[model samples]
Target: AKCVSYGVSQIKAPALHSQGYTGSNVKVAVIDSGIDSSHPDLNVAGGASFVPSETNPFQDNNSHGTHVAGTVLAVAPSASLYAVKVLGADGSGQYSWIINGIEWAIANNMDVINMSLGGPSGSAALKAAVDKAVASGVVVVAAAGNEGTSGSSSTVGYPGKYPSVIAVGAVDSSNQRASFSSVGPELDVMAPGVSICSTLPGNKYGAKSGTSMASPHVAGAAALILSKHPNWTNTQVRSSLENTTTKLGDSFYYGKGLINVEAAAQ
Candidate 1:
């Protein structure tokens, strides 16, 4: 049985699907713990890992990456989904591994990169790699972190805070910002993160909440846009997303606003 994901409706993904833009011909990399390539909903094109301990980086020991990959595929089912494992089974890893994954995406000419993981501390090396990836025309999207204290001072974490990446925050079904969603000047957009449904490990489907859950919506949308406008640059893809967002005020919290995949695709 298949139930429609709320995040999909909230982001208007079906509109893009109706327009025949299911992220076809787009190459997207989901850099996280790992992906369950066996998941029926996920058609993993390929994968690799910087973690030395993992022999097969495509295996999803931790369910985080699988969930994130599902969200990306939910919106862009036809896109080439690559599992770039940077984190271990504990959902943790070194920033260098993440940087390594970014470099791989760049070298492979990936159209979009979805990073649902982040750290509080910033890394110059990681930032440099992100800058280089953007310069190479790769659209990178990341989680804004779940450390919100409902204060203007609350800030986003590394990679997500980087100027070159599209930082994503979390919102509920009612479109209200999730209490745990990190907020700050780096926040770029919002998506349904609370109790949102998607594929999990063991060939299951479930929901988890975090800025992590919000990011893939944008990543999938970026792929959708690329499917329609394959020649558009990374800057143009980011611009399409930002320019068409549903206005929610407070640039420090919402940046442009909630993402509208249909509007961006059009």
Candidate 2:
């Protein structure tokens, strides 16, 4: 049932799998709406929510978190996945909750965290959360950008725009950038995000869009790297990924290049 053309071949996830790295024992937090705890493909290690109304982090009314979680799970099925719900069911949220979600991830000792969402303003508070997470040795991966530009100039947003976390851009075997995928000097890495399929809400599966979709693959890869090298610092893991990428295009636009998980896992 795998989509032969786009994903595993593109990122070489199977190569890592053959090398015995399925993110085993690694804890990855999907910091978004929530993850559907009931989804079969998702081995939800459980979750928590900062959303005031959504007390139950396992019940994902919005499909966003589940989709993002699945992308990471698909690559690293053995990893422990947690839902640090920040956004509400409407896929809307504030800086306070998001900041809390980052703190929660840190307190829980998560190995890697992914934020497929972003805000316009990069507050000092947000900067501190990122700085603290990075300093605490958490591998943070974030979506590059998605602002409405004249089709070619929206800069990367906060979190992703932050200098610390892996600011991911979207790409595919189509060997082209998604017009919807944002670009900037802050962009760190590229991953396959075009029409990728994964777990939806009701134990179902579907193909989703990019950038928002691209970031998680890097998250999973980071988890994979950590699982193999548990003692490595976040900076060491980041360097491995950045150095082993397959060159696709310009740095500012395409990032360090498409992520090669197997290469880094080695």
Candidate 3:
């Protein structure tokens, strides 16, 4: 691992590179704040914007969506990107629009669906769509909230708490879980979430911290694994990732432990 001393954030990029996986033919759908599709690092494809018919979905109002996209693109630069603009500039979105985005992604036969956005309460429509997505063999990944202990409570939010999706928590560069990471017995795994560096919206680079950032690393990794083993189901891919994760801290904080792509590929 030339890039790392084996911490959480450092391992992800190395893992992607080691496996020679570049997200080539897979179509990954991101439902969040819009992306700067022209960014040099991303193989972004345009998708529908549900915020409103009048708004242009190409713009990113906040840095969060841009960062998340960059991490996934880091692993799969050539992979097709599906932009489902569910969240508006404010980073808050209606439940109906979110459900619409998921259904649209599924209809498009998205190989992987990456969502870093969530809110309190669950929607029946959205849950049904997610259940359908999992049943159809699509890997649905989401960010556990960053409020730590408070985040996973009843107010912790939906989508991540939803049983059908793979809920991801956050870890720091030391291979330790971030203090703000949302932990639960329900969490499937943790990834780089602290001071993580990746491409930004303006063709620049910087570091940001959140489970929002961590989820895409897994999403990107799933892309890598899927590219190699196209016959593998979502469960197989998920299991492969979990099995290779490096155990870090207690189960509450580390979940299945830090993600190890080098080990998983073999």
Candidate 4:
């Protein structure tokens, strides 16, 4: 029988969890609005807020970050989770805040930095931030963006569009590309993003759909790899994730394909 959670079962993350590799000792930093640290299943270690208006980084007024955190821990339950709140309560923030979040992750020795946020245009500072984190041995993962409209000619979102970051698109339960998932050559992989079940504020759970939901799956998989390999560099983890994906049609939509955590951990 398949695992109860569709996202976990779809990527076969439970297989790795059974082998005593539940992202133990790996630090994953979620860069978004904020996370509800009191959520029971989350077990959020600690975090900082780049949004000066929001003094408490542990309180997720937007609920987006909490949902993203739940998805990350769904795969890597034992991984040390940190919240780097860059976005404000409106689910929006400046590029400089994101850059600062990346810098904080590197300085704190985080293994995987999950950015389930992105924008239309690329920024030089954002690109430099991602490059610096990668150079510092941090695996950076981000959402490809929800800008798809059939044959429209829009590009993937930045920070995600950066070559140094793992840009993840969205796929539904049918293994087809989500209509809202942006398509481009920069997309590195796809994951379950439609109606994904994860934590919300006030100790709740709900379903959300978007490339934002897809990126955390890759981030959690990266954490699991670090838990097992321990010494593999960020490049090795990225390559392993791409190399092990179950191919699904064109590279523009699915990139390397759907993430397979079981295959990657091996």
- Top-scoring candidate (TM-score): 1
lDDT of 2 by residue, 1-266 (tens): 43222565678888878878888999999998898988767778877999999898898898999889888888787999999999988999999999999999999999999999987788999999999999998999999976524445548988888898789888866768887777877888888888888888886888887788888888888888888888999899999999999888888688888889888877
Cα error of candidate 3 at position 50, Å? 0.7
Q: In model 1, what are the clashing residue pairs, if there are any?
A: none
Q: How does candidate 3 score on lDDT? A: 0.77
Summed backbone clashes in each candidate are: 0, 0, 2, 0
Give one digit per residue, the lDDT tens place, for model 3 in 1-266: 01111233365545555556666788898888877776766667767788884265566777667778877876566678877788877788889988888898888989899999777678788889889999988999999777667544432346988877888888776677777777777677888878767766677678788888889888888887787778889889888889998887777666788777666766
Ten contiguous residues with the weakest lDDT in model 2: 1-10
Best by lDDT: 4
lDDT of 1 by residue, 101-152 (tens): 9999998889999999888898789989999999898999999999986655
* Model 2 regions lying over 4 Å from their true place: 1-5, 148-154
Supply the global lDDT for candidate 1: 0.88
lDDT of 4 at 259: 91
> Of the candidates numbered 1 and 4, which has the greater lDDT value?
4
lDDT at position 45, candidate 4: 84
Off-target runs (Cα >4 Å) in candidate 3 are: 1-9, 12-19, 150-156
Note the residue pairs that clash in candidate 4.
none
